[PDB]
Amino acid sequence: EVRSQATQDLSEYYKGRGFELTNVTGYKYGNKVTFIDNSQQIDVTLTGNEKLTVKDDDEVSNVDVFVVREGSSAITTSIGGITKTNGTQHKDTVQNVNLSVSKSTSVTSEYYSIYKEEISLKELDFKLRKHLIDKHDLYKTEPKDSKIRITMKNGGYYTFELNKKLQPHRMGDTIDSRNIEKIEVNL
């Protein structure tokens, strides 16, 4: 089967390294929050839709950061993915969500385990697409109108269109994982 350079670039991006900083402190200047992890500087661009506790100063503490390097380079540029750190200390799942994957004539069901109380669409999108690449042949073929839909316990839903990266402006969007009803993917 056919796969374009566009599909190959989606695959290279979502098979790349995404990592977490847990309960860290960073410093805001303008629309960037800078974190130091080991000796590495990480500058995270804010989107303006973050769900952060209101502060007086430039200190952003008690946050988790899901980091995905864009580009190559000394400083690591990442977009969004800052969330409140977990109140709990148990390290086990906070929610176990029904995940269905439809293909073309068949449906596969499994549970998808979420470890964070408040989680970015950035991290959900990244980890789910990586899981779909590893186990469900995502990007072996042209994705076309393939979508992930995250439905919330109040009936609202979010859509990730799999034929393009998640739009940068949405990467700060944050949800309470206890409110996720189900995840449905049509491939």
Q: Which is nearer to Cl ion, 26 or 125 (CB)?
A: 125
Measured CA to CA in angstroms, residue 131 lies from 61, 139, 180, 185 at distances of: 30, 12, 18, 12
Contact (CB, 8 A) for 47 and 39: no
Shortest distance, CB of residue 1 to Cl ion, whole angstroms? 29
Closest to 164 measured CA to CA, from 3, 62, 23, 11: 11
The β-bridge relationship of strands 180-186 and 147-152 is antiparallel
Using CB under 5 A, list all residues that contact Cl ion: 158-159, 175-176, 179
Closer to Cl ion at the Cβ: 88 or 179?
179
Residue closer to Cl ion by CB (options 132, 166) is 166
Measured from the CB atom, the residue of 180 and 187 that comes closer to Cl ion is 180
What contacts 24+ positions apart, CB below 8 Å, involve 52-60? 52/82, 52/84, 53/84, 58/27, 58/28, 58/29, 59/25, 59/27, 59/28, 60/25, 60/26, 60/27, 60/28, 60/33
Minimum separation from the CB atom of position 59 to Cl ion (A)? 26
Q: Whole-number minimum distance, CB 122 to Cl ion, in Å?
A: 13
- Give the H/E segment covering residue 45: strand 40-45
Q: How far is the CB of 43 from Cl ion (least distance, A)?
A: 26
